[PDB]
Amino acid sequence: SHMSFIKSQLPIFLNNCTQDSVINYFQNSWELENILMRSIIDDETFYINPDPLRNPLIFYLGHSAAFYINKLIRVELLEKGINSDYEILFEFGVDPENAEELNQAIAHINWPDVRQVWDYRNKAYEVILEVIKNTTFDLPIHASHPLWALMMGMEHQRIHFETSSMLLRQLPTEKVEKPQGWQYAPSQGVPNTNKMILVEGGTVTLGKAKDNPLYGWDCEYGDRLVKVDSFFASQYLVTNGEFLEFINRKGYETQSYWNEKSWQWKEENKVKNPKFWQFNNGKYSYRAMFDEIPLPLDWPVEVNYYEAMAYCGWKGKGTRLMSEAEWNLAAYGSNNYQVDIEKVNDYNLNLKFGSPSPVGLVKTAQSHSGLWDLRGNVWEWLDENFHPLPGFEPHFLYEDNSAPFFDNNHKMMLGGAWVTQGTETLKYYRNWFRPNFYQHAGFRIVTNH
């Protein structure tokens, strides 16, 4: 048994994006985000920015709606917006290098009332639904079709369901209410031995073809052949129990496992353990979305990139993280691979659970290479600076989606998490974050020999 009462619709091929199917997918995208945002009990909590590097929650309540409107205006499927001031106020978010830069940016913003932003959402929903009902869906949809703006808006909303869930997780438990049917994975369980598996080397082609019949973001496209040498990777994501051993061996107290930049981050934030653990009465509790529970020892540990690399430092002996090409080889092999959307059901993706799961519990989630949960459970960090593939081109609808972040200051992560939905659960999505940032994200370890 797994989570069932809250359901996320699978993504749809562009050749099957009929008006009726898209109506259902749109309604589901929006209702899911509504369920998440309604879990905040008190409206005053929307003026908190629980992550010090992101905007207050009120911004994210409006932003998904404003983005749909702004892109539909840009392709001229909408002749006017709903509230021009809000379309500007909620237009774009933030990716600051530090909390002081963000604090300076948000210091003098007059935010609307929570009820006014909910009213904006409800009006936007009805305006977009009417656009859908009054537009011909001439199959197939594609990147030069006006309806690309709608496809982009729905994936953007599902991405913000995921990133907003990480903000609500940073609120105190007394400030949020678990939605009916939210179901965590089973949590008792000591981890099994995490064996190193030889991944046979081969050649991969990274990227996505322009006429592939699936919505994707600009940075997904291009074509890059990479020869990948054989390498060893741990069959499981590193677990909470494995990371607890690192803590007990003074992992956060030993400079040689860190570097000057990551140690500085650790000291500045007085970090002694992963973000969502707390030590009390001699033992660690763990913060799931809405509840504190005993630390689930066999779940994948959730860390930022700095902490993943510090664990690699403790392992020593050339222990490292995979590259993007190495993850692709392990997850999809060397094959014109035809995505099968139904396979999303085989991994802890798309709200199969409302939490990470024990490594290996989902019995269909072993890739052919032998590695477990390459797809799903938690994103996994990669030692790969976010970068374009040959053939990359920004899209007119969102020219700065990815180009600003090809800056050697963002590391990549791939594969999707329990909370990931839409085309972000499939092969081509490329994800990236500053290395100090927290997501529903872990890692596995690699050695060359």
Q: Would you state the structure tokens that stand for residue 77, as one six-digit string?
A: 């499927």
Ligand-binding site membership of 160 (annotated): yes
Q: Using CB under 6 A, which of the segments 165-173, 282-290, 329-337, 431-439 binds ligand AVJ?
A: 431-439
Print the binding letters for residues 43-82 with Mn ion: x by CB under 5 A, - otherwise.
Answer: ----------------------------------------
**Shortest distance, position 137 Cβ to ligand AVJ, whole Å:** 25
- Interface residue with ligand AVJ, options 9, 19, 34, 163 (CB under 6 A): 163
Residue 420 engages ligand AVJ in binding (rule: CB under 6 A): no
The Cα 204–Cα 225 span in angstroms is: 6
The Cα 439–Cα 38 span in angstroms is: 21
Q: Using CB under 6 A, which of the segments 103-111, 155-163, 240-248, 357-365 binds ligand AVJ?
A: 155-163
- Interface residue with ligand AVJ, options 12, 37, 143, 159 (CB under 6 A): 159
Please report, for residues 32, 200, 310, the alpha-carbon distance to residue 227 in angstroms, rounded to integers and kept in the order given.
41, 11, 28
Q: Tokens 């619709």 identify what position? A: 9
Residue 187 engages ligand AVJ in binding (rule: CB under 6 A): no
Cβ proximity of 288 and 353 under 8 Å: no
Print the binding letters for residues 407-446 with Na ion: x by CB under 5 A, - otherwise.
Answer: --------x-------------------------------
Residue 120 engages ligand AVJ in binding (rule: CB under 6 A): no
Print the binding letters for residues 66-95 with ligand AVJ: x by CB under 6 A, - otherwise.
Answer: ---------------------------x-x
Residue 360 engages Na ion in binding (rule: CB under 5 A): no
Residue 220 engages Na ion in binding (rule: CB under 5 A): no
Residue 432 engages ligand AVJ in binding (rule: CB under 6 A): yes
Ligand-binding site membership of 2 (annotated): no
Residue 51 engages Na ion in binding (rule: CB under 5 A): no
When the beta carbons of 154 and 322 are compared against Na ion, the nearer one is: 322
Residue nearest to Na ion (CB): 415
Q: Using CB distances below 5 to 8 A depending on partner kind, what does residue 380 bind out of Na ion, ligand AVJ, Mn ion, none? A: Na ion
Ligand-binding site membership of 63 (annotated): yes
Residue 431 engages ligand AVJ in binding (rule: CB under 6 A): yes
Q: Using CB under 5 A, which of the segments 44-52, 311-319, 320-328, 380-388 binds Na ion?
A: 380-388
Residues 6+ apart with CB under 8 A from 329: 199, 201, 202, 204, 228, 369
When the beta carbons of 82 and 412 are compared against ligand AVJ, the nearer one is: 412
Positions that interact with Mn ion (CB under 5 A): 93
Residue ranges of the binding site for Fe(3+): 63, 156, 160
Positions that interact with ligand AVJ (CB under 6 A): 93, 95, 156, 159, 163, 431-433
